Amino acid sequence: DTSFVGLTGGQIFNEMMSRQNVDTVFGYPGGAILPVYDAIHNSDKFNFVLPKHEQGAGHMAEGYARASGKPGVVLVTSGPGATNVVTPMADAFADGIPMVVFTGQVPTSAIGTDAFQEADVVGISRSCTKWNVMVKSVEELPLRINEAFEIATSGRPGPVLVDLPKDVTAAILRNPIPFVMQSINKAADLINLAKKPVLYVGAGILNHADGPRLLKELSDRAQIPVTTTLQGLGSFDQEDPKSLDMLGMHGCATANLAVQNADLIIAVGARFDDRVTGNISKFAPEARRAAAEGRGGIIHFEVSPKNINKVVQTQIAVEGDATTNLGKMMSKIFPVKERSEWFAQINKWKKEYPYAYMEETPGSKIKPQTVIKKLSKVANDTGRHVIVTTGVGQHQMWAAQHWTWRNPHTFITSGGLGTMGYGLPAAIGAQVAKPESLVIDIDGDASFNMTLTELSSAVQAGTPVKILILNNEEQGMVTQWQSLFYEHRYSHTHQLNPDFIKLAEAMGLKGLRVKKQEELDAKLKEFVSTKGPVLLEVEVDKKVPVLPMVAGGSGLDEFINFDPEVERQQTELRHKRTGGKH
């Protein structure tokens, strides 16, 4: 090819973005990356979103990718610019989010001299990228860009980093540049044999446009109840009777009980992380027993060999794209008419273990769980497409439990790394991906404080995001652990919040606040109906634990369920131990 000859490395970058079908780029300029910013000045090949902090660009790109299905592209400078995107990269690495991060670097002749704004970005990002590299020459630039996008979007999607020395991007190109089938059958037999099967679905099913469809097909065909992980929410319609909801540490008791009593667990695009399995040795006993008798066990539809048999020994492993392999064994699955025995047990659990919690009473404070339920309906009553992002903590768990998920790619949350401050920037990026959607960020006060500077970025990008802050004036998830395992010793978990409404107004947004239950319903209406970016602060009760809960050495079936009397005794104890402070 000789179409690039005569162009600078930066101009080649501009063209390559076009070839990769990039329509949006998130970044912050800086000295080392100036040659690239000059070549993309007023570019019409893609839109550009400017944050206030590189961490924002990073999280914005993640939200964008998770909502659009396309890799998020980041463009920052060297030194601090690159170190500032490490968290987003580690975050995208843990959740398998496709992201291509371009970092400006000092001239190749300055590298290794402790140069101005120089960092060993390739070394620093090594553990949090599927692959990274430093471009040495302009003739090598197109190849590295093409490899970066390919790697980031194949296998298990993930982040990649391309280091761009200033002299390389300023340089002008002169010279023209140049068994599974067996596993599928063995897996189908086991399924046809299962008496109490359960579908354990994860983020993997959402990595293919036809994932949700085939999942439903297999579920309806063989009548198999489906439970999903935090990252799997949205892949299955929770309206369907076969829905077990979310499993794990803070999952539905029914979901966890089903998994513990199942003779066959079909793992689809899930990695059995420690937030799901509970005590690994106590995980899926019935499945282990069934496997011992050659009448069940665990089937794993995983794309990455290294996640196979990593946490728990499986009986059958189907390597490759889950959606693809499911479509292949569909014809090898005997249609199941009914499962009265299995379904009877599950329905009994449902009625027995619902998402119970201390509901409001005359004069009491608004309850966080209630806000989620109400907001879920109101948002749905708009008919608009809905995408929800969140921060990290109790509010995140409650948003997961009390919202009714039915559409894929509508829940964007930080799971593996659990990065506080993810909500706002991720929502902004998601809004850019789906301009027509009603993007809502269900945030916590502590999380919000982390990246609240991006509020002005929302206004500058023209993203009418709705920011909901469940303010319990505490780092709730940590405080819950201190209450439960640390004799109510709240060590540095209560920060001083700024006036959120005045903050919103200062940032150029509309601010709303709710204190009384009598105003919640109306405020929620106005919130979702407001045109443009808006922030709604809802004062919710404090020291409210997320239940059920499976922690420590407890098995998924040994969960701590809600009990009104226990909460009351806990409140009295908390008061006595904190001197009536909490």
Place this chain on the structure above:
Amino acid sequence: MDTSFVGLTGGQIFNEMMSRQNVDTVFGYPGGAILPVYDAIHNSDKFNFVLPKHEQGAGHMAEGYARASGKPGVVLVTSGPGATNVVTPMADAFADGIPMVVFTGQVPTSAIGTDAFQEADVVGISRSCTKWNVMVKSVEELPLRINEAFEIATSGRPGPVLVDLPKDVTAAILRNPIPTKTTLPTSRAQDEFVMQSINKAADLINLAKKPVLYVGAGILNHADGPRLLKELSDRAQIPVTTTLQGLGSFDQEDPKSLDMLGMHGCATANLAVQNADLIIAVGARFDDRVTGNISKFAPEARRAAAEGRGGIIHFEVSPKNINKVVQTQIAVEGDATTNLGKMMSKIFPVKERSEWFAQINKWKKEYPYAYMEETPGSKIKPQTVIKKLSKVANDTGRHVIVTTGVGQHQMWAAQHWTWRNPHTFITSGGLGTMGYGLPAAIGAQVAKPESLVIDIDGDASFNMTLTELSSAVQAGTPVKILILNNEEQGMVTQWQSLFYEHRYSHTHQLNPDFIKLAEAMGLKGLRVKKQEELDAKLKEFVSTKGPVLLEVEVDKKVPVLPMVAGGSGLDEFINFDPEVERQQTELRHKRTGGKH
């Protein structure tokens, strides 16, 4: 052996080690993996705990605290995102040699390598930006690792170190005695070698005719640094120039002061360096923002060296920075201050240097820090604000500490402020981290409760970490935040104006209402736009008790000059010229379609 810790948890042992290491302040943010340690320091009276809204804030606060106190900054954050959030501050401290010990919680040892919840390979991530790091494998070695961390961070060239703390290690109870040495916090040939290099250095200095002391941060790493630097300067009549990180080490009120050298340094300083026959480098690393085109650096010193009558003497503590950028004739290893003390008696007292000084005074009159001053109806000039604030702050009689963001405002603060006291300028130089200003100011205020702490910030820099505004309120640190608002990434637009034909690619951001932001955060907000209101607002600013933010609307697209860039030598600098600034303005309006 030592059995005094038997029965204690790792967290409790940690708490105990802090007081043994003389730690009076800890900056941190709690999280799951680090809970055992947080439970152990709950209500501890061994030290004041400072809580930010973001771990990056904790890191920068710790740096500002260290730079102002001379003590290592201690950070305590959780695993995963908590640790990755402090990578910038560590890389920042690594670049500027700031002593800091970062403690990051970690998942249980049995969960490491399983892609556990909130797990990150922090020792791998931080290896290139710490002097040393380690992951404590058992509670038995916790005291050992803590002592090694503080020792390493505070010796040689100070820097950051990271200690990874697995949750099971900190929650574990020590059930085995441990070596007493691990719990408790020279060569005759080398000394004679150093003295020999000192005698060689003295000999070279005694024959110099046009000497120049090039002083950096190293001189401030010792309490007697400034004093000895002054004694040597007076004894041998040697003019003194400092790097950005050396500002405050030499009284700029002294006639022998040359001010700052480098890319944006005083022309006199740069000219003195280009014509000196001897350059006595004291605690400076010849970085690329100082030397200009290296092959054009100190030509007269290179010539004197070739003739065996001069060259470069380097007082450096780290072997890594000896003969790294330029060939030096005599390297004096070790603490600069200490070595200057040993060398003093070998220095011949000098009556005077008429010719040398006359030449320098000639350059001073010809090349002052000139710029376009205000005119009727024009916006306030950033340089003018600095000069006015400098005098208002100095006249208070209080001890003043200045922190900054990164950019033009940073350079103008360095040039136009009158530096006289050590450890009063706290700025990010090597890595140049925008957003450093506020958190660093809070940290410095904590270190020096009686000091008037001022953060001279840029609008873009301030936006990076403005969430720490509420932290200042919660911490009780009455920091004075000054925002020189030009509504642009000034330092970048300056480069775009000079080398990219005024093409401002994504360097203009939409700012929030700073005064309303300040008040929303819980502090007093002030704004000034008119020239005649500047004096009164600055007075109100520094006189306000409590944290306060003052936004000053300043002119836009104003370049920082002098400027040495590209392949230019320190003497081939661009100087301020009113006609040129006018022509540039005209060219800019046309090229940007009147937008800028």
